[PDB]
Amino acid sequence: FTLPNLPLSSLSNSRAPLPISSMGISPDNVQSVQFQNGRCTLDGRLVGTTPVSLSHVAKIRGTSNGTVINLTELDGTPFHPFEGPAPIGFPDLGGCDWHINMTQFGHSSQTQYDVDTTPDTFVPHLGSIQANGIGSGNYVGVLSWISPPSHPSGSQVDLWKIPNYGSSITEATHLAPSVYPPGFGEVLVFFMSKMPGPGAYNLPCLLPQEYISHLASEQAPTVGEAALLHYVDPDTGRNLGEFKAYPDGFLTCVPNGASGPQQLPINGVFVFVSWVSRFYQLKPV
Amino acid sequence: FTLPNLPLSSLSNSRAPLPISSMGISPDNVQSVQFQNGRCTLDGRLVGTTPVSLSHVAKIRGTSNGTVINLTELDGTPFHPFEGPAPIGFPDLGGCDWHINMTQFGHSSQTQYDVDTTPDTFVPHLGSIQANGIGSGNYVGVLSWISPPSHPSGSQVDLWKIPNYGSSITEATHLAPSVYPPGFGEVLVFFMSKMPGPGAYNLPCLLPQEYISHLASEQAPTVGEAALLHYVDPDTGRNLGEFKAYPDGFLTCVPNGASSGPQQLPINGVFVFVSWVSRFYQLKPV
Numbered sequence: 001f002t003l004p005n006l007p008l009s010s011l012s013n014s015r016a017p018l019p020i021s022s023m024g025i026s027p028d029n030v031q032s033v034q035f036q037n038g039r040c041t042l043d044g045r046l047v048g049t050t051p052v053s054l055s056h057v058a059k060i061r062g063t064s065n066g067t068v069i070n071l072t073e074l075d076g077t078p079f080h081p082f083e084g085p086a087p088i089g090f091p092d093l094g095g096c097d098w099h100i101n102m103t104q105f106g107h108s109s110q111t112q113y114d115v116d117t118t119p120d121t122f123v124p125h126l127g128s129i130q131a132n133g134i135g136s137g138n139y140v141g142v143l144s145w146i147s148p149p150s151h152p153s154g155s156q157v158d159l160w161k162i163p164n165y166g167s168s169i170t171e172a173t174h175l176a177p178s179v180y181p182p183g184f185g186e187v188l189v190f191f192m193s194k195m196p197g198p199g200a201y202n203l204p205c206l207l208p209q210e211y212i213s214h215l216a217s218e219q220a221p222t223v224g225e226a227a228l229l230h231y232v233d234p235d236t237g238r239n240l241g242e243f244k245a246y247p248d249g250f251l252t253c254v255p256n257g258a259s260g261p262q263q264l265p266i267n268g269v270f271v272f273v274s275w276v277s278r279f280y281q282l283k284p285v
Numbered sequence: 286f287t288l289p290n291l292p293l294s295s296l297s298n299s300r301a302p303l304p305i306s307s308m309g310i311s312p313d314n315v316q317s318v319q320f321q322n323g324r325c326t327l328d329g330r331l332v333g334t335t336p337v338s339l340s341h342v343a344k345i346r347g348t349s350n351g352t353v354i355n356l357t358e359l360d361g362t363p364f365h366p367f368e369g370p371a372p373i374g375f376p377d378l379g380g381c382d383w384h385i386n387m388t389q390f391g392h393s394s395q396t397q398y399d400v401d402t403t404p405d406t407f408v409p410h411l412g413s414i415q416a417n418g419i420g421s422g423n424y425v426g427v428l429s430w431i432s433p434p435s436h437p438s439g440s441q442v443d444l445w446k447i448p449n450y451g452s453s454i455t456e457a458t459h460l461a462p463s464v465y466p467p468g469f470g471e472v473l474v475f476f477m478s479k480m481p482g483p484g485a486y487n488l489p490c491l492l493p494q495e496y497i498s499h500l501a502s503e504q505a506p507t508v509g510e511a512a513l514l515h516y517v518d519p520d521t522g523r524n525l526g527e528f529k530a531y532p533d534g535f536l537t538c539v540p541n542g543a544s545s546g547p548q549q550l551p552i553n554g555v556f557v558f559v560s561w562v563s564r565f566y567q568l569k570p571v
């Protein structure tokens with residue numbers, strides 16, 4: 001079994017096309033996460049709206065009629081509600097407004113599309129989102145920057161959330177399931193990127209995008225209960241810390257105090273060591 | 286040795302962050318190319334301005350003073366002329382004007398940056414490009430759409446070219462070398478993507494980006510003269526055509542005239558390494 005032999009700082013976020021700047025852990029008020037992008041099992045199963053390629057990450061495609069944008073997949077093929085909470089690659093950043101850069105095949109210009117994901121018109125699961133002034137036409141959009149949510153008024157930016165893909169929060173939208181810290185002092189490890197906008201926004205994801213393409217290619221025929229990893233400094237070969245990767249597609253470690261993986265340098269490489277028990281006890285970082 | 290076990294249609298261009306829509310060949314007035322992005326050898330050596338990740342492809346970073354933008358690497362670290370023709374990831378699309386979307390850490394808004402790559406102020410090899418009205422500040426920019434070059438005046442979009450990175454065409458800028466078709470009668474295979482802008486623009490590259498990160502991770506210890514590949518339909522296992530991958534990081538096939546060839550092939554296939562063969566191994570026409 002392998003993970004990419006590439007330093008983290010050379011890789012991308014899987015929730016937006018941004019370089020990885022650090023690893024991190026969630027705030028204490030966040031336990032589980034339910035990201036829809038950046039979801040891939042260790043045997044190569046893409047989950048949620050996750051694409052193989054970063055060229056599809058945090059993008060939209062659709063036709064505006066001036067009132068709504070009727071969404072398709074990125075290549076123009078139809079999207080249907082049975083397929084997921086939104087088309088493949090659709091942004092999954094909750095807790096913020098989006099500003100999406102819209103361009104067109106065969107036309108000049110770009111247009112900023114401002115997206116509040118809270119109103120009842122934002123129903124990407126049913127293939128429809130408000131146009132909010134975007135004129136009639138077919139567009140491809142990519143997430144460019146974010147800002148605080150328009151509703152509730154005065155809300156903070158909380159990128160540990162996902163948007164409401166349905167007409168209400170009680171509508172079933174085929175979300176990929178939540179990911180939980182597995183217990184016994186283990187914390188979920190996140191890969192972070194700086195996101196432009198009017199604040200110091202840091203976007204967490206569960207796996208770098210290049211890990212997703214690697215795993216989806218590798219299609220490991222063997223996956224055990226948990227993969228013991230070392231985070232290694234490439235030049236010296238020094239083991240900087242033990243981590244576990246779990247079959248559902250996430251990494252953990254046991255921090256040695258509040259001052260964790262966030263302290264580790266970001267130019268290391270995760271290396272598979274061996275398959276271990278689900279309850280294998282890690283050495284604190 | 287391995288290439289990604291992923292269909293081409295799931296992958297990205299390596300010269301802009303765009304899905305692959307087809308394979309193609311160059312026009313018959315283009316033999317060689319000198320792309321600076323999308324360059325990786327079979328043993329994992331990144332060449333030119335090529336980055337490991339698509340998150341760095343066709344991007345810029347720098348500080349405007351209102352007149353010039355002084356460039357850095359994407360992460361803010363200094364760029365110096367000895368390092369290359371431009372910072373890693375810098376766009377390499379010749380034969381067009383660029384329209385770059387500029388954003389800022391800590392500020393609202395985006396700004397369009399219009400780039401004519403022909404004037405003597407466009408000197409990314411020396412770390413400086415004209416601001417063209419972009420106000421003072423630090424920005425990250427990504428290529429968004431393209432249009433015909435502003436100069437010379439009435440010329441067509443030509444994405445087989447690279448820009449002039451230096452003060453003049455005679456300045457040495459440490460370009461990655463040109464790639465030529467090798468023989469006989471093998472053609473260079475290009476991976477194409479649709480690029481937004483006021484025309485039917487198709488952007489060629491030599492390798493999907495995910496091949497680059499794969500090869501850079503793999504660091505193959507035993508590369509031979511040429512890799513014999515099959516382009517396989519995953520479901521049926523049918524070999525749709527024999528191809529060769531060459532050490533310098535490009536693929537070829539022999540089209541059966543103009544009835545079979547890269548453009549006629551479905552884009553949902555997977556390239557599979559078969560074996561190492563001699564440089565002069567003759568392929569069966571596609």
Ligand SMILES: CC(=O)N[C@H]1[C@@H](O[C@H]2[C@@H](O)[C@@H](CO)O[C@@H](O)[C@@H]2O[C@@H]2O[C@@H](C)[C@@H](O)[C@@H](O)[C@@H]2O)O[C@H](CO)[C@H](O)[C@@H]1O
Binds near residue numbers: 399
């Ligand atoms: C943003 C724009 O689409 N740029 C391309 C476009 O520019 C020309 C047209 O927009 C035209 C419409 O009447 O007006 C011209 O002013 C404009 O020229 C561009 O901007 C001026 C200020 C000068 O800097 C010109 O050198 C520059 O081209 O079309 C041109 C080709 O005509 C280019 O593709 C521009 O990128």
Ligand SMILES: [Ca+2]
Binds near residue numbers: 122123165
């Ligand atoms: Ca909503």
Ligand SMILES: [Mg+2]
Binds near residue numbers: 004006268271
């Ligand atoms: Mg790694």
Ligand SMILES: [Mg+2]
Binds near residue numbers: 289290293557
């Ligand atoms: Mg392939």
